[PDB]
């Protein structure tokens, strides 16, 4: 059967997800995680349907931006694979 060489599909996916607009995190797992973390500060809290969506949009934007910055640091070392030290360097330089 026909088989694509390594990386052809990665580029196709890159184009697909750069052209799309939908959310990428599963709604239920995120909602359960939010309800779990909030329990340490105050018990029996309640959340409106739009608050979880606002938190999801902010978190997704933050991670996308951090990955964009990490990609520059990876190319600078003449590597292609991103590694934890690259994230650590980007975060240190950003002053987080």
């Amino acid at each position: 059967p026909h088989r694509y060489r390594p990386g052809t599909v990665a580029l196709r996916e890159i184009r697909r997800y750069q052209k799309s607009t939908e959310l990428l995190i599963r709604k239920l797992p995120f909602q359960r995680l939010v309800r779990e973390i909030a329990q340490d500060f105050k018990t029996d809290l309640r959340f409106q349907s739009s608050a979880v969506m606002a938190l999801q949009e902010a978190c997704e934007a933050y991670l996308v931006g951090l990955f964009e910055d990490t990609n520059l640091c990876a190319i600078h070392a003449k590597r292609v694979t991103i590694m934890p030290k690259d994230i650590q360097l980007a975060r240190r330089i950003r002053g987080e």
Binding site: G7, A10, L11, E13, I14, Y17, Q18, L24, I25, R26, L28, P29, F30, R32, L33, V34, E36, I37, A38, F41, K42, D44, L45, R46, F47, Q48, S50, A51, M53, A54, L55, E57, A58, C59, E60, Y62, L63, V64, L66, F67, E68, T70, N71, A74, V80, T81, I82, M83, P84, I87, R91
Partner: protein, 80 residues
């Protein structure tokens, strides 16, 4: 609890693909989970503080908008 495991590997791959990353090392997942957890913790502490000041019991979208606004990032589309 195990709820942190709900952010499966494919979701992280999709996020990395949107950022243009072509090849990803297998250790990036635990670091990404650690980075996300502290951000969520930071935002929720402020949101819950605003909720508690108002004597409410339900957390509304305005409290999240103000938390993000204090951290220095503005969100358009949910209110305010």
């Amino acid at each position: 609890r195990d709820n942190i495991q709900g952010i499966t590997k494919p979701a992280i791959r999709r996020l990395a693909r949107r950022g243009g990353v072509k090849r990803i090392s297998g250790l990036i997942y635990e670091e990404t989970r650690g980075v996300l957890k502290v951000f969520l913790e930071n935002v929720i502490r402020d949101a819950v503080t605003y909720t508690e000041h108002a004597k409410r019991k339900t957390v509304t979208a305005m409290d999240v908008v103000y938390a993000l606004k204090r951290q220095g990032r503005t969100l358009y589309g949910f209110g305010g």
